[PDB]
Design an enzyme around this catalytic site. Structure first.
Site, PDB file in Angstrom:
ATOM      1  N   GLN K  11       0.876  -1.217   0.107  1.00 19.86           N
ATOM      2  CA  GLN K  11       0.048   0.038  -0.173  1.00 19.86           C
ATOM      3  C   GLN K  11       1.009   1.277   0.041  1.00 19.86           C
ATOM      4  O   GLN K  11       0.494   2.082  -0.599  1.00 19.86           O
ATOM      5  CB  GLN K  11      -1.020  -0.015   1.151  1.00 19.86           C
ATOM      6  CG  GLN K  11      -1.860   1.155   1.373  1.00 19.86           C
ATOM      7  CD  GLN K  11      -3.012   1.084   2.173  1.00 19.86           C
ATOM      8  OE1 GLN K  11      -3.150   0.207   2.962  1.00 19.86           O
ATOM      9  NE2 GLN K  11      -3.923   2.220   2.200  1.00 19.86           N
ATOM     10  N   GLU K  71      -4.031  -6.653  -1.831  1.00 20.85           N
ATOM     11  CA  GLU K  71      -5.460  -6.145  -1.314  1.00 20.85           C
ATOM     12  C   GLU K  71      -5.834  -5.377  -2.573  1.00 20.85           C
ATOM     13  O   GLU K  71      -5.341  -4.737  -3.291  1.00 20.85           O
ATOM     14  CB  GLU K  71      -5.342  -5.454   0.051  1.00 20.85           C
ATOM     15  CG  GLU K  71      -6.780  -5.215   0.368  1.00 20.85           C
ATOM     16  CD  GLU K  71      -6.470  -4.241   1.442  1.00 20.85           C
ATOM     17  OE1 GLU K  71      -5.674  -3.633   1.739  1.00 20.85           O
ATOM     18  OE2 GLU K  71      -7.460  -4.574   2.648  1.00 20.85           O
ATOM     19  N   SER K 140       7.954  -0.530   2.295  1.00 19.54           N
ATOM     20  CA  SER K 140       7.753  -0.143   3.931  1.00 19.54           C
ATOM     21  C   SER K 140       8.089  -1.544   4.666  1.00 19.54           C
ATOM     22  O   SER K 140       7.824  -2.559   4.172  1.00 19.54           O
ATOM     23  CB  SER K 140       6.259   0.250   4.184  1.00 19.54           C
ATOM     24  OG  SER K 140       5.495  -0.818   4.310  1.00 19.54           O
ATOM     25  N   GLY K 144       2.915  -6.081   5.778  1.00 19.27           N
ATOM     26  CA  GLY K 144       3.294  -7.566   5.460  1.00 19.27           C
ATOM     27  C   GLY K 144       3.521  -7.795   4.162  1.00 19.27           C
ATOM     28  O   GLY K 144       4.492  -8.730   3.691  1.00 19.27           O
ATOM     29  N   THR K 145       2.999  -7.220   3.208  1.00 19.16           N
ATOM     30  CA  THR K 145       3.275  -7.341   1.941  1.00 19.16           C
ATOM     31  C   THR K 145       4.512  -6.717   1.340  1.00 19.16           C
ATOM     32  O   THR K 145       5.560  -7.214   0.964  1.00 19.16           O
ATOM     33  CB  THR K 145       2.155  -6.885   0.797  1.00 19.16           C
ATOM     34  OG1 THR K 145       0.961  -7.464   1.218  1.00 19.16           O
ATOM     35  CG2 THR K 145       2.392  -6.855  -0.625  1.00 19.16           C
ATOM     36  N   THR K 179       1.939   2.364  13.474  1.00 27.00           N
ATOM     37  CA  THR K 179       0.286   2.053  13.154  1.00 27.00           C
ATOM     38  C   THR K 179       0.291   0.351  13.320  1.00 27.00           C
ATOM     39  O   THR K 179      -0.325   0.065  12.557  1.00 27.00           O
ATOM     40  CB  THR K 179       0.173   2.549  11.912  1.00 27.00           C
ATOM     41  OG1 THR K 179       1.057   1.907  10.845  1.00 27.00           O
ATOM     42  CG2 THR K 179      -0.008   4.071  11.859  1.00 27.00           C
ATOM     43  N   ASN K 206       8.320   8.315   8.970  1.00 24.70           N
ATOM     44  CA  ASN K 206       7.098   8.993   8.963  1.00 24.70           C
ATOM     45  C   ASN K 206       6.716  10.241   9.928  1.00 24.70           C
ATOM     46  O   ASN K 206       6.142  11.155   9.456  1.00 24.70           O
ATOM     47  CB  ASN K 206       5.864   8.177   8.855  1.00 24.70           C
ATOM     48  CG  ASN K 206       5.266   7.511   7.763  1.00 24.70           C
ATOM     49  OD1 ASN K 206       6.321   7.381   6.344  1.00 24.70           O
ATOM     50  ND2 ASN K 206       4.138   7.180   6.999  1.00 24.70           N
ATOM     51  N   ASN K 228       3.762  11.500   0.469  1.00 24.98           N
ATOM     52  CA  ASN K 228       4.103  10.871  -1.109  1.00 24.98           C
ATOM     53  C   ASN K 228       4.698  11.740  -1.930  1.00 24.98           C
ATOM     54  O   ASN K 228       5.548  11.470  -2.830  1.00 24.98           O
ATOM     55  CB  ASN K 228       2.940  10.315  -1.499  1.00 24.98           C
ATOM     56  CG  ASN K 228       2.566   9.068  -0.570  1.00 24.98           C
ATOM     57  OD1 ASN K 228       3.216   8.516   0.225  1.00 24.98           O
ATOM     58  ND2 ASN K 228       1.150   8.447  -0.753  1.00 24.98           N
ATOM     59  N   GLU K 254      26.514   4.933  -9.539  1.00 26.29           N
ATOM     60  CA  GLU K 254      27.495   5.718  -8.521  1.00 26.29           C
ATOM     61  C   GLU K 254      27.212   5.806  -7.394  1.00 26.29           C
ATOM     62  O   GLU K 254      28.132   5.859  -6.150  1.00 26.29           O
ATOM     63  CB  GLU K 254      27.570   7.122  -9.182  1.00 26.29           C
ATOM     64  CG  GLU K 254      27.953   7.206 -10.527  1.00 26.29           C
ATOM     65  CD  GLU K 254      28.075   8.784 -11.385  1.00 26.29           C
ATOM     66  OE1 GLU K 254      27.984   9.495 -10.520  1.00 26.29           O
ATOM     67  OE2 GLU K 254      28.209   8.761 -12.607  1.00 26.29           O
TER      68      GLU K 254
HETATM   69  N1  LIG Z   1       4.941   7.242   3.456  1.00 25.72           N
HETATM   70  C1  LIG Z   1       3.940   6.385   3.352  1.00 25.72           C
HETATM   71  N2  LIG Z   1       3.793   5.254   4.328  1.00 25.72           N
HETATM   72  C2  LIG Z   1       2.624   4.561   4.386  1.00 25.72           C
HETATM   73  C3  LIG Z   1       1.641   4.992   3.393  1.00 25.72           C
HETATM   74  N3  LIG Z   1       0.663   4.050   3.675  1.00 25.72           N
HETATM   75  C4  LIG Z   1       1.073   3.010   4.444  1.00 25.72           C
HETATM   76  N4  LIG Z   1       2.294   3.389   4.824  1.00 25.72           N
HETATM   77  C5  LIG Z   1       3.181   2.575   5.867  1.00 25.72           C
HETATM   78  O1  LIG Z   1       2.933   1.305   5.661  1.00 25.72           O
HETATM   79  C6  LIG Z   1       2.933   0.593   6.780  1.00 25.72           C
HETATM   80  C7  LIG Z   1       1.963  -0.746   6.845  1.00 25.72           C
HETATM   81  O2  LIG Z   1       2.004  -1.330   5.389  1.00 25.72           O
HETATM   82  P1  LIG Z   1       0.845  -0.796   4.461  1.00 25.72           P
HETATM   83  O3  LIG Z   1       1.455  -0.129   3.146  1.00 25.72           O
HETATM   84  O4  LIG Z   1      -0.124  -0.015   5.090  1.00 25.72           O
HETATM   85  O5  LIG Z   1       0.316  -2.410   3.980  1.00 25.72           O
HETATM   86  P2  LIG Z   1       1.288  -3.401   3.444  1.00 25.72           P
HETATM   87  O6  LIG Z   1       2.739  -2.996   3.312  1.00 25.72           O
HETATM   88  O7  LIG Z   1       0.631  -3.902   1.923  1.00 25.72           O
HETATM   89  O8  LIG Z   1       1.124  -4.926   4.245  1.00 25.72           O
HETATM   90  P3  LIG Z   1      -0.088  -5.529   4.462  1.00 25.72           P
HETATM   91  O9  LIG Z   1      -1.397  -4.668   4.699  1.00 25.72           O
HETATM   92  O10 LIG Z   1      -0.062  -6.642   5.654  1.00 25.72           O
HETATM   93  O11 LIG Z   1      -0.409  -6.176   2.988  1.00 25.72           O
HETATM   94  C8  LIG Z   1       2.581   1.673   7.853  1.00 25.72           C
HETATM   95  O12 LIG Z   1       3.596   1.486   9.197  1.00 25.72           O
HETATM   96  C9  LIG Z   1       2.784   3.018   7.208  1.00 25.72           C
HETATM   97  O13 LIG Z   1       3.858   3.622   7.904  1.00 25.72           O
HETATM   98  C10 LIG Z   1       1.550   5.888   2.455  1.00 25.72           C
HETATM   99  O14 LIG Z   1       0.851   6.156   2.004  1.00 25.72           O
HETATM  100  N5  LIG Z   1       2.837   6.922   2.599  1.00 25.72           N
HETATM  101 MG   LIG Z   2      -1.966  -3.674   3.033  1.00 27.25          MG
END
Ligand SMILES: Nc1nc2c(ncn2[C@@H]2O[C@H](COP(=O)(O)OP(=O)(O)OP(=O)(O)O)[C@@H](O)[C@H]2O)c(=O)[nH]1
Ligand SMILES: [Mg+2]
Ligand SMILES: Nc1nc2c(ncn2[C@@H]2O[C@H](COP(=O)(O)OP(=O)(O)O)[C@@H](O)[C@H]2O)c(=O)[nH]1
Lengths: 56, 428, 36, 117, 47, 50, 47, 50, 50, 41, 440
Positions: K11, K71, K140, K144-145, K179, K206, K228, K254
């Protein structure tokens, strides 16, 4: 008066692990560098004591 | 009759060559379309030194533009003079050096050296009688330093009796443009010591000092810095392409300036540099040319000559001057500064006079000076190198490209031996 | 407009403002051809 | 098959110049010269004769699928410069841990370079 | 915008500042297996 | 260039009703044709005395 | 609504690009493009 | 008594002055090398700096 | 209300039709260069400025 | 004469920078020219 | 000839890539429908889109990107949004059930299903790459993903491509806000498996971007789009040399040579210097000295690590706009004299520079001001050992009682991988210590 930050608790299980990157020529140089860095703990800022000199 | 093949490698080499060929084109009267529009017969009698004949009154440079990734030559080709190069002279690959000497010397430059050697042979054996070569590059990168030395190593094997010039740009003392630059400079210097006849060392912040103190330019672009290197490049070969009372080509200077084979590192300088409001405060005369020529704030390397002794000094004058004045001034320079000249060479000055000055100028001169004070650049590079190599700072990016660990030991030993050899003649 | 050309020619603006009357005022190569 | 070499024009047919950015086969740079003629070592339907030695490798290739490649795959670069001797020994033993992935057709091609102290 | 004309010297080059687009073009690329060098049509910025 | 300027001025005269406009391009093309006329006059006079 | 004052400057350079042919001034140097051997078989040489 | 340990920062200043004195000794030794070769000989002043 | 909506939509749409015609004319004007045809001389008319 | 001037400069510099409220960054800018030390061997 | 494949996973990856690709389209002339508004040249036109966009036969440019998520509700917004016509339909991969804050779902059971589809799409996109440089992966550390499947992607790409460059744009866990609860487990596991399958790893927090948006920018109560857009500006300034003219060009190869000194320390921090609002830009001249000094301010950093608590090892500086190299020389010369900025003895150089004449672009709706100069500094500092120690303690508190490990042990991942991942980062902890001591 607020006291300084602590060193954060870790297990004794992972305190016997050594390093993986040997970046010094000899072991004597390693001992000399670590025996010169360990006197300036109380005068260096930040946890793990690897920062600046905290100044006047 | 005496032709020069020009090579450029890397971003630094290509960007300096793009200005050098423009300067030579203005000197010989060549439009951006490639034709000839000169107003004197002397601009056509010796045009074969740098140009090849083509039909229709058109001339093409002898350049071989070399780069590992063609991102720089795309911007070179879009310039006012970028369409005059032959299309088959651009040699390029798909992947860059990444500021890695080992990559550009063994991994990526090995797959690209065959086509460059083919182009060089094609452009060198079509000449009537080859005089020598010219290479512009830098010692801080991976393409101009890695493959730029591989080109010298392969050229010197085939043509072992031709003049091999290298207008290299060497590292600066204060601010670094590359982190791993001491490694690249050390290895490229180790290659350059045993494979070149002359080497002209240019420091970027020396050019910044020139543009700030002497020209008073608040915003000097890199083209303004490259203009000075081009002007000091075209002064060395100005007696091949133009007549003179006293002629001196590259070989005559190589004889006069190199007393020992390992001591061929020179420090250039361009004489008539005047700011934008003070052209009325100085006259183009031989005393007011040699006053600026020998000055410390006029040189192109960041080491003043007071740190050592001059061995040999040259000055290729251009214009219509009385050479009695030239001889008297170059005698007075030596006689006034007794301690900054060596004792076992009775005359340290080689003088050449050419009749044709640069356009818009009565007279000019190009300083080339073999000074013992070049050793402090070498010592700076060596101590910056042994600061890293003691703890093996960035060695994993070099040995992973197949290198050997005694390479850096060997290069540092050669550099230290060169410094000691320079120290031998410091105290007679 | 910005400038004042000496032979001022406002007729096409007059026609266009006659058709579309919400057009704003027009406040501030000298001869025609026979085809015009 | 067998990937031969256009001797002058090998540079256009290089594995990276044909817009193939993955790992590729190595080409044959030399061709052996043999005299005489060949015996017949097979019969109809392609079966090898019982008096001809065979290869111990399995037929249908050696291809590792996604669900057969090993968990925690070994290094690809694996340079040993500036490492502890025990740690570099561990990384090398991690390379040699799975010989089936190393001899796969789409297998790993590690570059064990350098030397620890 | 008058055009003056100066001699070409090491200290005379007056850059522009009314220039935002610094786009480059791929005049040096590749093909099936070959290095193509196509003719330049646009400068820096697509002009 | 004089042809290009005159053609650019000609094609833009056939724009629709409201967007027949005093764009800065119109002033630029008028200055284009004036500058080229002056340059041509200089070149022709100097050809005569050559 | 703006979108145009970002990709393009609302300005023009007050000077045209200086050409490199002031030929009446390049030849204003004393003895323009005249070598030293032209004095042999002439009248009155001086520099 | 915790506020009585506000002189802990007072010895930080003295440690800074000691480090500055070490730097000044370094500067003094490195400037003395600018003397001519006949002048730079072993001397009691060098032993004092050591 | 539906009739008022349709009136305003069609007014905006006549404006857009004029805009697309003028855009085509100006885009054709941009594709002009010295080394091309589709370009002639034209008489200096007063309609080039109106 | 040169040696005497050098020692007088050393004494004067040491007296100037000893006076307190001198910070480090005004103390390392006095004698600051990079002199590389001669080759290792 | 300078193509790079952006691989957005998770995400965070998809929502970052939305702003990144909006700015990529706006910086060039490409409309949201994938077509240029016109063809102003007769047959010319710049080919500068070849770094990011692939042109079809007629007129349409398609991005060189793969959007992966487990998702549907994050990719389906792009699928029915404004840039729906811009993206190729098969470039947006989507699973049915998500990883749900678990590394094991993204690494062993669920993420091992779509890995083939992403690998074949990556191969198809790399087939049109004439001069491919490397991959850019956005994920990130806390999801999980983005933690499991990104690690699996590195796992497969090292086998299938060898020594090809792959840069990271990670979202590091923050030191006080989070989070999730099982975030330290994902962080330790996906750091352990990708300690070596990544050439470089640019991380931003963040909470630090929240602090920058509150303090430097005038806005309060920000959303994820404001973060973003800043991350998109960072990734545009990194890849600006490949598409625009430069006095000093910075290739993607580089970065690993001028920023990664040793084979495991490859975690530099990113910072963008003149991030200021419009009315603050109205009163401020933004010369090279000011914006070079503002990069080294502890408050202006985009990761919540104080640089005064450690030692600088390598710095890579990328300049944009009306920038004179003389002023860059002077400004970096000034910084080395400072005492509050401390370096390591074995790196006397410590700087790699790059200047690009293209000024940064202004996306409408963003709060950033139109500036003539910008620096994107990527600094590798030893001061990150505070963050690794805090993450170590946070993993430690939960692993003492073996909380939440039933969710991991019951899905094909053994318990022992915790014991060796933690041991490997505990080794890395003193690996940072060995490079911070000076030789005397
Ligand atoms: N900078 C930024 N960080 C994000 C954003 N959305 C989620 N995150 C970070 O992503 C972390 C959680 O993972 P997500 O991206 O929400 O979901 P995921 O990485 O696909 O993992 P799953 O939901 O288990 O599949 C959170 O701790 C947030 O700090 C975003 O739009 N911008
Ligand atoms: Mg997710
Ligand atoms: N002095 C000077 N140096 C330049 C110029 N262009 C590039 N360089 C230098 O080139 C070095 C970078 O090496 P580069 O040639 O770009 O790497 P390469 O392309 O892999 O060979 C830097 O130290 C720059 O100072 C120039 O115009 N003048």
């Amino acid at each position: 008066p607020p006291m300084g930050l602590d060193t954060l608790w870790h297990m004794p299980h992972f305190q016997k692990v050594g390093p993986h990157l040997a970046t010094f020529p000899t072991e004597a140089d390693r001992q000399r560098a670590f025996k010169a860095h360990r006197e300036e703990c109380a005068v260096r800022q930040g946890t793990l004591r690897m920062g600046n000199y905290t100044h006047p | 009759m005496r032709e020069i093949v020009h090579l450029q490698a890397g971003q630094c080499g290509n960007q300096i060559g793009a200005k050098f060929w423009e300067v030579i084109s203005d000197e010989h009267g060549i439009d951006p379309t490639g034709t000839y529009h000169g107003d004197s017969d002397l601009q056509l009698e010796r045009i074969n030194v740098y140009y090849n004949e083509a039909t229709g009154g058109k001339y093409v440079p002898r350049a071989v533009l070399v780069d590992l990734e063609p991102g720089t030559m795309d911007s070179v080709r879009s310039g006012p003079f970028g369409q005059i190069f032959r299309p088959d002279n651009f040699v390029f690959g798909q992947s860059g050096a990444g500021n890695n000497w080992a990559k550009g010397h063994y991994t990526e430059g090995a797959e690209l050296v065959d086509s460059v050697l083919d182009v060089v042979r094609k452009e060198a054996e079509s000449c009537d009688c080859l005089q020598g070569f010219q290479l512009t590059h830098s010692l801080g990168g991976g393409t101009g330093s890695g493959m730029g030395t591989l080109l010298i190593s392969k050229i010197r094997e085939e043509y072992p009796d031709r003049i091999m010039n290298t207008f290299s740009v060497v590292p600066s003392p204060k601010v670094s443009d590359t982190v791993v630059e001491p490694y690249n400079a050390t290895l490229s210097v180790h290659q350059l010591v045993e494979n070149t006849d002359e080497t002209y060392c240019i420091d970027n912040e020396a050019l910044y000092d020139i543009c700030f103190r002497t020209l008073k330019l608040t915003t000097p672009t890199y083209g303004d810095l490259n203009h000075l290197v081009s002007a000091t490049m075209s002064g060395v070969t100005t007696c091949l392409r133009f007549p003179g009372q006293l002629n001196a080509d590259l070989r005559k200077l190589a004889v006069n300036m190199v007393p020992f084979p390992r001591l061929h590192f020179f420090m250039p300088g361009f004489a008539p540099l005047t700011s934008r409001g003070s052209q009325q405060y100085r006259a183009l005369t031989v005393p007011e040319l040699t006053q600026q020529m020998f000055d410390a704030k006029n040189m192109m390397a960041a080491c003043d000559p007071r740190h050592g002794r001059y061995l040999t000094v040259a000055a290729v004058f251009r214009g219509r001057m009385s050479m009695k004045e030239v001889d008297e001034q170059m005698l007075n320079v030596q006689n006034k500064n007794s301690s900054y000249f060596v004792e076992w060479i009775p005359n340290n000055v080689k003088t050449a006079v050419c009749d044709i000055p640069p356009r818009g100028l009565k007279m000019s001169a190009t300083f080339i000076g073999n000074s013992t004070a070049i050793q402090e650049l070498f010592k700076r590079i060596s101590e910056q190198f042994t600061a890293m190599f003691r703890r093996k700072a960035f060695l994993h990016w070099y040995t992973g490209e197949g290198m050997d660990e005694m390479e850096f030991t060997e290069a540092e030993s050669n550099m230290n031996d060169l410094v000691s050899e320079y120290q031998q003649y410091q105290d007679a | 407009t910005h400038s004042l050309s000496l032979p001022w020619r406002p007729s096409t603006y007059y026609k266009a403002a006659s058709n579309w009357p919400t057009l704003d005022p027009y406040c501030t190569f000298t001869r025609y051809t026979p085809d015009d | 098959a067998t990937n031969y070499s256009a001797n002058q024009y090998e540079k256009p047919f290089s594995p990276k110049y044909l817009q193939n950015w993955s790992l590729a086969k190595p080409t044959k740079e030399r061709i052996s010269s043999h005299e005489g003629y060949t015996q017949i070592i097979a019969n109809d339907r392609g079966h090898l004769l019982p008096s001809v030695p065979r290869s111990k490798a399995s037929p249908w290739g050696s291809f590792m699928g996604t669900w057969q490649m090993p968990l925690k795959v070994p290094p690809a670069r694996a340079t040993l410069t500036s490492r502890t001797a025990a740690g570099a020994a561990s990384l090398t033993r991690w390379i040699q841990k799975n010989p089936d992935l190393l001899k796969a057709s789409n297998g790993l091609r590690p570059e064990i370079f350098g030397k620890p102290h | 915008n008058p055009v003056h004309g100066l001699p070409f010297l090491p200290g005379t080059s007056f850059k522009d500042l009314t220039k935002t687009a610094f786009h480059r073009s791929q005049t040096l690329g590749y093909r099936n297996g070959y290095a193509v060098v196509r003719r330049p049509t646009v400068g820096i910025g697509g002009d | 260039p004089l042809k290009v300027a005159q053609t650019r001025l000609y094609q833009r005269s056939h724009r629709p009703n409201v967007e027949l406009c005093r764009d800065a391009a119109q002033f630029r093309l008028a200055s284009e044709v004036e500058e080229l006329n002056l340059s041509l006059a200089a070149l022709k006079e100097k050809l005569l005395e050559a | 609504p703006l979108r145009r004052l970002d990709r393009f400057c609302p300005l023009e350079l007050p000077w045209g690009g200086p050409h490199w042919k002031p030929v009446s001034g390049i030849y204003s140097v004393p003895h323009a493009y005249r070598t030293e051997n032209s004095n042999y078989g002439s009248l009155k040489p001086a520099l | 008594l915790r506020l009585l340990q506000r002189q802990r920062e007072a010895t930080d200043r003295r440690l800074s002055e000691v480090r500055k004195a070490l730097l000044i000794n370094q500067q003094s030794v490195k400037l003395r090398g600018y003397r001519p070769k006949s002048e730079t000989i072993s001397d009691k002043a060098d032993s004092m700096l050591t | 209300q539906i009739r008022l909506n349709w009136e305003h939509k069609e007014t905006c749409e006549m404006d857009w039709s004029d805009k697309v015609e003028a855009y085509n004319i100006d885009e054709a004007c941009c594709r002009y260069n010295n080394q091309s045809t589709d370009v002639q001389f034209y008489p200096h008319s007063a309609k080039f400025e109106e | 004469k040169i040696g005497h001037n050098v020692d007088y400069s050393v004494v004067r510099l040491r007296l100037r920078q000893r006076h307190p409220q001198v910070c480090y960054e005004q103390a390392q800018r006095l004698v600051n020219d990079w002199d590389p030390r001669t080759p290792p061997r | 000839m300078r193509e790079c494949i952006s691989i957005h996973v998770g995400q965070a990856g998809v929502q970052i890539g939305n702003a990144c690709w909006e700015l990529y389209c706006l910086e060039h002339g490409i409309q949201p429908d994938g077509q240029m508004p016109s063809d102003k040249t007769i047959g010319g036109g710049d080919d500068s889109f070849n770094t990011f966009f692939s042109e079809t036969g007629a007129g349409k440019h398609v991005p060189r990107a793969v959007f992966v998520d487990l998702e549907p509700t994050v990719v389906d917004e792009v699928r029915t949004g404004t840039y729906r016509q811009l993206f190729h339909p098969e470039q947006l991969i989507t699973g049915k059930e998500d990883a749900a804050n678990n590394y094991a779902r993204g690494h062993y059971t669920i993420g091992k299903e779509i890995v083939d589809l992403v690998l074949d799409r990556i191969r198809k996109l790399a087939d049109l790459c004439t001069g491919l440089q490397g991959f850019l992966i956005f994920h990130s550390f806390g999801g999980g993903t983005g933690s499991g499947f990104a690690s699996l992607l590195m796992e497969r790409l090292s086998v299938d491509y060898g020594k090809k460059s792959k840069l990271e744009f990670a979202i590091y866990p923050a030191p006080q806000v989070s989070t999730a609860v099982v975030e330290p487990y994902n962080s330790i596991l996906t750091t352990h498996t990708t300690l070596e399958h990544s050439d470089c790893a640019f991380m931003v927090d963040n909470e630090a971007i929240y602090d920058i948006c509150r303090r430097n920018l005038d806005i309060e109560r920000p959303t994820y789009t404001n973060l973003n857009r800043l991350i998109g500006q960072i990734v545009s300034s990194i890849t600006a040399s490949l598409r625009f003219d430069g006095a000093l060009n910075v290739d993607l190869t580089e970065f690993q040579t001028n920023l990664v000194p040793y084979p495991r320390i490859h975690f530099p921090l990113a910072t963008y210097a003149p991030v200021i609002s419009a009315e603050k830009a109205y009163h401020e001249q933004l010369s090279v000295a000011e914006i070079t000094n503002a990069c080294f301010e502890p408050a202006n950093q985009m990761v919540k690590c104080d640089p005064r608590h450690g030692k600088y090892m390598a710095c890579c500086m990328l300049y944009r706009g009306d920038v004179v190299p003389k002023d860059v020389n002077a400004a970096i010369a000034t910084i080395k004299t400072k005492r509050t900025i401390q370096f390591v003895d074995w790196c006397p150089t410590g700087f790699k520079v790059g200047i690009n004449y293209q000024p940064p672009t202004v996306v409408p709706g963003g709060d950033l001001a139109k500036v003539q100069r910008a620096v994107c500094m990527l600094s590798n500092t030893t001061a990150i050992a505070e963050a690794w120690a805090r993450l170590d303690h946070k993993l430690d508190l939960m692993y003492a009682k073996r909380a939440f490990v039933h969710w991991y042990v019951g899905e094909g991942m053994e318990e022992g991988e915790f014991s060796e991942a933690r041991e490997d980062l505990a080794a890395l902890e003193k690996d940072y210590e060995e490079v911070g001591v000076d030789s005397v």
